[PDB]
Design a binder for this molecule. Structure first.
Ligand SMILES: NC(=O)c1ccc[n+]([C@@H]2O[C@H](COP(=O)([O-])OP(=O)(O)OC[C@H]3O[C@@H](n4cnc5c(N)ncnc54)[C@H](OP(=O)(O)O)[C@@H]3O)[C@@H](O)[C@H]2O)c1
Ligand SMILES: NC(=O)c1ccc[n+]([C@@H]2O[C@H](COP(=O)([O-])OP(=O)(O)OC[C@H]3O[C@@H](n4cnc5c(N)ncnc54)[C@H](OP(=O)(O)O)[C@@H]3O)[C@@H](O)[C@H]2O)c1
Ligand SMILES: NC(=O)c1ccc[n+]([C@@H]2O[C@H](COP(=O)([O-])OP(=O)(O)OC[C@H]3O[C@@H](n4cnc5c(N)ncnc54)[C@H](OP(=O)(O)O)[C@@H]3O)[C@@H](O)[C@H]2O)c1
Lengths: 279, 293, 286
């Protein structure tokens, strides 16, 4: 009677990939097919899950959830799409998304494959809230203020300068989309530096997001919208990618961002009862 | 109300369009007409003004109790003087704080001389914010008040940017950054530019090129006013006042309420802290004490 | 019933005036007197001190179990050691953070010689904010804590600017701007400002700006075990000397339950600061 599980492979067991594993197991319409790592990591000590070096080893795989680093992700995805497998990623470079969508689109439409890209937290569901604020109040300004919380790239940036080993760099929101940078031990915003004993003692993967728009609806001024969340960032991103995996099965070949897909397509459940429950 | 107050709107800009709605809604007043520069009369007639006397001098309106000046700050004290000199009361929302005392003296002479009332600086931040700020002072005489105007366009500063060279269109916002201090956000439609600091220099400033600054405009604004001080000798008295409002809707509504008050004062010039609050309200005295006190 | 704890107030200034009210209200404590510089005894008696033994030396107050020091920071360690040396316990809210470990060792040596307790640094930020900071740290060992000391008069900065040039009078404020950082607001009765983000304004009367209340915002996001994104906020909006003198009076109560030595506030069972029977405090509070 009921439907067969969606078979998911996770590509790149890193910070996002561990959380993705939890979200796959918990998805009641999804089963883990296996984890794909570089060959160098297969040699490492293992943390019952088929951990292999290529999707071919994992049997049937409808969707591969890409948890690899940004730079390598487009190339990886184009390869997996060319094999008929759908791909999900949370590609987080805003300005290259338009180009990557087109690049992923071409491969997917040929191999009857769906690719959903930039399906994470701010490249992701924050984009969906932004887009909805946009059409409810077309005149005005939106500010996305990332509450105190790490900036992976920024600390990884500072990790590449000569000095006392290890560093933590943070973007701190100072309002109206502007941020201050605080580094614990790249020049156009105010920076503060502190030396610490153990940078590892300061690390926490939660983050705050405050997004606001003040705008006019139709012709009426002073429409106020505020969206706020305090969350574990990698858990939310992996969960958003797993919901996108469900949605990728319900699309036509091609490549989509999350504002190009019906919100109901991300939800597990019977359409009518989702409507009855949510709308 | 028997013989309503005949109100003329002077200058049909942002504030004049909102002031027309305030006049309409007010039960004790009726619109006498709108006064515009001859240049604007030659432009086509807006739809909301169909059936409205729209003229270049207030004489053509005939019998005007109060003139609600919705004119640019610089031009308004001189416009107020002329109307006062005809025995016509004037409301304005003149917004240069540092010139209010002097402007008040200048309007006071003319108005007393001609049996007219002027109420000046009667908008939002000069205006009702003044009244609030002043009640806080006598409630807690020792301490400090901060007025933080929430993200929203200052037009005096936005038009400043439109004036500089290499500037097709610009939008410049004042943004509170606490303690009465403010940052400035400039959106320009065109290092890069000769942005430098034609003034602005004594303000932290951020510039940004956008496609269509018209797409960014909303006339709402936030105001957060805070005071910590001493009542008598007790410390740590805490006061907070906040509004999220349509700025021109408020300013013009305050001006129309001030028009009501003008009809009640002896001749002279007044700021809003020089009039009993009850003068601004429509209704019987005892009924308003009973509703409000 | 026990006899009341006899408390003496050392130094009758700002903190000293509030301490008097705290001692009076404290049901288990009794005012032995106030101790001032002899130069201050020649001045006229404050009305609140009518009927109070005001004196130049604690030896004239009879039995004195605890002395609450409301003396300026730099003078307070030497005054403490003198009183501990007689076997009287001492409370201070000494507030030079970088110096507490050192003062504590010094105060500890004398305390143990004369069967006396010193509780030092027992105020609001040196003091109960320290206790709160410390509970957060063990509750979530990985992460960062920001103490944001809301608008509120400084003391060292105020007196810093109060000197320098044509400063007839001045008031210096610390303002929080987030994540532990602060801006300085200077009201004065020229460009010189050197000695952080600072603003300077001239005013006719600096005394008209004075209010002795303060806000404090403590926030922490960190990890419990391996679980991320645990959120903690602590806030107070208070009369600073009223709270500081109350905390010292509470420490006077805790000092009577310690063994000899010097203690900061994160070194004393919270229950020792509270009036009442042990078991009853537990069932009502734990
Ligand atoms: N949109 C959002 O909100 C959002 C938020 C967070 C993250 N992201 C995306 O997620 C990524 C960061 O993930 P993360 O924090 O989990 O990173 P991570 O911990 O560094 O994990 C990356 C993993 O990819 C594999 N890998 C590393 N270098 C590789 C290479 N050169 N070629 C192929 N595979 C390689 C490794 O897994 P193996 O050992 O198994 O090979 C590694 O664990 C970024 O690319 C970002 O775009 C997006
Ligand atoms: N105190 C407060 O809280 C507060 C708040 C907001 C604004 N305001 C005051 O409101 C005033 C008007 O603001 P607004 O948004 O209504 O501005 P606006 O849209 O520019 O309106 C100004 C109007 O004045 C008329 N005008 C008369 N003489 C003029 C001249 N010499 N140059 C240009 N225009 C002239 C024009 O109408 P015609 O074409 O019909 O002649 C114009 O539309 C400001 O100057 C400000 O001081 C006060
Ligand atoms: N959170 C905290 O930990 C916190 C907060 C507030 C205060 N404090 C502490 O409180 C102290 C200041 O309290 P306050 O506001 O009451 O100060 P204050 O107003 O200056 O009073 C200090 C008093 O001590 C006496 N005194 C002054 N100079 C002296 C000297 N050189 N030698 C001996 N006695 C002297 C005087 O009393 P007589 O004239 O009667 O002799 C004077 O009124 C600081 O040292 C500070 O560390 C800490």
């Amino acid at each position: 009677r009921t439907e067969r599980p969606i078979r998911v492979a996770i590509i790149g067991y890193g910070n996002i990939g561990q959380y993705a594993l939890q979200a796959v197991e918990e998805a009641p319409d999804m089963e883990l097919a296996g984890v794909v790592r570089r060959q160098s990591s297969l040699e490492k000590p293992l943390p019952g899950v088929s951990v292999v070096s290529d999707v071919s080893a994992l049997g049937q795989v409808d969707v591969a959830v890409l948890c690899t680093p940004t730079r390598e992700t487009p190339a990886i995805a184009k390869e997996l799409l060319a094999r008929g497998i759908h791909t999900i990623d949370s590609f987080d470079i805003h300005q290259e998304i338009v180009q990557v969508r087109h690049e992923l689109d071409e491969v997917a439409r040929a191999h009857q494959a769906v690719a959903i890209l930039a399906a994470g937290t701010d490249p992701g569901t924050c984009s969906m809230i932004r887009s909805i604020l946009e059409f409810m109040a077309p005149y005005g300004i939106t500010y996305t203020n990332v509450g105190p919380g790490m900036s992976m790239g920024h600390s990884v940036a500072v990790k590449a300068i000569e000095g006392v080993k290890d560093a933590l760099a943070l973007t701190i929101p100072i309002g109206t989309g502007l941020h201050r940078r605080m580094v614990y031990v790249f020049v156009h915003d105010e920076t503060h530096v502190l030396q610490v004993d153990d940078v590892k003692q300061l690390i926490d993967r939660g983050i705050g997001v405050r997004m606001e728009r003040k705008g006019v609806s139709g012709q009426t001024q002073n429409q106020l919208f505020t969206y706020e969340m305090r969350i574990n960032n990698p858990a939310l991103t992996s969960q958003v990618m797993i919901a996108s995996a469900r949605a990728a099965m319900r699309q036509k070949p091609g490549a989509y961002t999350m504002i190009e897909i019906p919100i109901i397509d991300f939800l597990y459940g019977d359409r009518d009862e989702l409507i009855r429950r949510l709308v």
